[PDB]
Amino acid sequence: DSRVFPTQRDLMAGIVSKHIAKNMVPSFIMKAHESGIIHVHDIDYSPALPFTNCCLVDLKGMLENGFKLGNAQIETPKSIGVATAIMAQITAQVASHQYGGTTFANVDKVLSPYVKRTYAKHIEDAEKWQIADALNYAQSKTEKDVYDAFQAYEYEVNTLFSSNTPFVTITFGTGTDWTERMIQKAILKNRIKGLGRDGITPIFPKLVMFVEEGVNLYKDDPNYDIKQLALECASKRMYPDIISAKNNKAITGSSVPVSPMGCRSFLSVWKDSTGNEILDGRNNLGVVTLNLPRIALDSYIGTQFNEQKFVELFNERMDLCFEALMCRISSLKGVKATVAPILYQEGAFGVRLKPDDDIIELFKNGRSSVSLGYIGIHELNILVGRDIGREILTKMNAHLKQWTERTGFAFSLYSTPAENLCYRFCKLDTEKYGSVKDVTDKGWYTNSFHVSVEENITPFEKISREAPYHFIATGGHISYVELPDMKNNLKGLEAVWDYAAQHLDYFGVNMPVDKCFTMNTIRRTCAYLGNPNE
Amino acid sequence: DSRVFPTQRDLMAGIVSKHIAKNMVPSFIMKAHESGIIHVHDIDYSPALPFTNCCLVDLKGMLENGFKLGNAQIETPKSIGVATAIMAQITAQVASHQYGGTTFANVDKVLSPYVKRTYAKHIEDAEKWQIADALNYAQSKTEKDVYDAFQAYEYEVNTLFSSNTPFVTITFGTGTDWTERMIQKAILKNRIKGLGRDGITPIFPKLVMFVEEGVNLYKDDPNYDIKQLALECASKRMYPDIISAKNNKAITGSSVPVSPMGCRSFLSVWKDSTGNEILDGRNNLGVVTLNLPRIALDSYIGTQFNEQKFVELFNERMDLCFEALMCRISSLKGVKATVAPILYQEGAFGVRLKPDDDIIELFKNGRSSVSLGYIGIHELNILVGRDIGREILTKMNAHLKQWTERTGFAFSLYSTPAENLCYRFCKLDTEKYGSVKDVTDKGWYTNSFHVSVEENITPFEKISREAPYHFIATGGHISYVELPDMKNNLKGLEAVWDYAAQHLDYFGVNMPVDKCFTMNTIRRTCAYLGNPNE
């Protein structure tokens, strides 16, 4: 919404920031950006200010040790309701100190300890008031306290989303314990109910569920009942999306399932000075997306594609992207942890820096990821006349490997969500080449490696075609399948998940999600849920 | 804190806004502002954007009817914990759509109904689980639920204060019912405990308590026990401040005690089209403060004060202030309720406007107040050689009466908090006249009609000297008394309150509030609590 005060103030800061970037970013980078050769994301935040992008918040480390929120020294919560309330408070803090999404990974595992304190208190209350059914009481009341907790989290998020922007992601699914199972059902059931009187579909927090054999994949795993609720939820509210724990670990090289930071940014395995695999508290430093159809367009001589020209534009644009990413990483030199206490001093990034410490040292040596985005492989294939998707991407990775070796920053290939960039690249390519059949004519570029829409493909076929890209674009990727109402056909939906889980990493399903308020109309046309009526 | 991201972004919007104001405010107003003749407050928000200033939120009307928060249709809360959580969510909404303080008046009365729903549920739970002590159970658990509710509100406020700014005020004291009494003690007890591990003193929400004979003034009123807790609270955390219900109603002309909007802005009695006295949902449109010592300084000829010159500067500066206030009120013409749905469409301003309705119509005919501020009566008295405080103010009111009759807006005389303006006026007057003994030498002007500090005056004397100004500056006023540690002398403190309550409207007491964390050092040097170490 643009007429709203919070949005107007933000555009003012954004205008000042785009102006400042103009005086800080080397001219050749800004022109390539203005012309649509590449896209420097979030130029309205960075580099005017030394913001970072998305992250996995180290909530576990914050709740167990304490942490300062303002001047107040917060202590380990003593109940589930107070721990999700604190989670919501951390969410508000983190959202205003980075410009990308914030993720709370494995809330079933992390919050589990507070469901137990809540249970214990209801047992201590079963005797103190001489309650007959002591165990079934502590069970009932605890159930209700976890439910209430996640209902309150959802409304907290909903308010932030309207008093500011805030993309937050909640992941779970690997926990088996009874506490962990209760959190999962609590999250899934609040979602199914929806928001407010008319139980509408919320756009955040995004929900992502880990599915794994032995946990909740097959009819006989401990949590198959949850997968069933999860399926009902997805049919009614689109989320959760799912991640195949199996493929996810092979891609990331990580011992435990890696939750995306924001929409789909994936970290790669990393160890601290002592051999420990750290996930939570890590972040991403920014995205610079390469316009791939445009490298191909700029390679035409007359109406003919020139292969040797392409190779030169590709190589030179790769160095250009590198230069763009480094420009912003350099904007972080000399910035102090005073810039964002919640992130650098109080534990959200998993370490404890002193006011006067430089924040950049924390991101070095593979700890933070750095993103080289891309878009439009479908349109690129068309302009070059054959399918070079897997090939061009594999080559980008080899460049990325050298960048990583030269600088120590962990560059990875990222499948840009490009909710708007999909229009912006197409429109700037069009000002130069006009309507190009099958490329710029439709008005937008297809996202990353997705098979274009307008392609009568079955779900399994689409999944089978996209799956290899998940093992290539390691920094971020997702696959979508369009499906009709699956509310009375949960086995259908499950069939697709099962296939997805087996072949790829991160997956979600787009179906219509509406209600005759006698209305609530949601669609995932690009990356987020939205009312297509707007 | 300035190095922090949220603050930096805000300064950017503020810079753009001061620039825009320069192209919208008539030149003669901006110069008078630049030179320190007057002070247009919040120029970093308005008029660049059609923001209003402070308000009493119509929480009662929002909780009982429903209201939309984003797209979610919120319903009457079913528990005390959920109603204060919603209150906190409304607080975040309101703070980001106005630039001044937000007040929740009489939370003891307004929230009372949810303490009863919470009680009922614990009774329905006393039987369902066969509980012996049914009544003492519902009593214990409810007590704890109200306590938990207000503890959660306080931390919510604390987070907002650090992820943005937000001045929020909570008033109570007139409720006698058991539910109302429980809310009051719940608010007072959480405050006494303080925030976090080290139980530090919070700077918000400000707490103000109505004191009244028959309610809680005398040793035998129903709520004298609360006044006693309130006194202990004030000795330990400065708040609450108090308002003499008695004087307050005579000044405002209102049947019920009028809570200040923000720090000390007071509405005057007003009726809707149907004869009803509306308080909640009303607001203030802005403050323009008149530099009084400066009118006197600019009246000196050589080292001598010229009375006839003063009269001319006073008259012309009064018209100037009027012009300044009207300039901004005019900036609101044509602004639609789409600008702030929570405020205009969903009930916070107590009415329900349609997207396409003009917001200005809501403020007309005395509904919103409009502020003419002033400062430095102590320094003015010195420069003119006699005490003309009550006189100059009374004259300002006569001008205000005509302004109100000419425009329909309810202009009132306002005792500007001037946390910074006290330095800014003095420093600009100094660039012109230099060090002036007893006036600009010390570096700041005394607030409104306060007796300057540096004056060995007893508390009752100070109270007796300031009290008449509360019946004059009807738009906003307060009186402070400095006192040493009164923790082991609550009768002393009570003596002062009692005297204050009898003679004036709004009162608070400044004492030292510290803790050897073996530190937390708070002082109210100007208008808010603060760590004088900064």
Ligand SMILES: Nc1ccn([C@H]2C[C@H](O)[C@@H](COP(=O)(O)OP(=O)(O)OP(=O)(O)O)O2)c(=O)n1
């Ligand atoms: N919305 C809230 C409520 C509490 N806290 C903080 C204050 C303490 O440092 C820590 C402890 O929380 P509690 O679990 O103790 O909350 P209660 O005091 O309400 O429950 P109890 O009296 O059972 O401890 O959490 C917080 O950050 N945010």
Ligand SMILES: Nc1ccn([C@H]2C[C@H](O)[C@@H](COP(=O)(O)OP(=O)(O)OP(=O)(O)O)O2)c(=O)n1
């Ligand atoms: N053509 C564009 C591109 C961006 N933006 C705005 C919207 C966002 O608030 C901000 C973020 O811009 P990005 O530069 O990151 O572009 P995207 O939002 O499309 O990409 P993604 O969804 O991958 O973040 O800029 C815009 O209005 N128009």
Ligand SMILES: Nc1ccn([C@H]2C[C@H](O)[C@@H](COP(=O)(O)OP(=O)(O)OP(=O)(O)O)O2)c(=O)n1
């Ligand atoms: N932090 C929260 C929690 C709930 N609500 C909203 C959703 C409903 O429209 C209205 C009703 O709240 P409830 O009192 O029903 O909250 P619960 O569902 O947790 O309790 P219960 O199941 O007893 O109704 O409040 C909200 O705005 N903010």
Ligand SMILES: Nc1ccn([C@H]2C[C@H](O)[C@@H](COP(=O)(O)OP(=O)(O)OP(=O)(O)O)O2)c(=O)n1
């Ligand atoms: N000399 C001044 C005056 C104001 N401001 C800034 C601080 C506030 O965020 C914003 C509000 O300014 P006002 O113009 O309203 O001045 P005050 O804050 O002193 O007055 P009051 O406490 O009555 O709001 O401008 C400032 O830095 N220096």
Ligand SMILES: [Mg+2]
């Ligand atoms: Mg506690």
Ligand SMILES: [Mg+2]
């Ligand atoms: Mg409910």
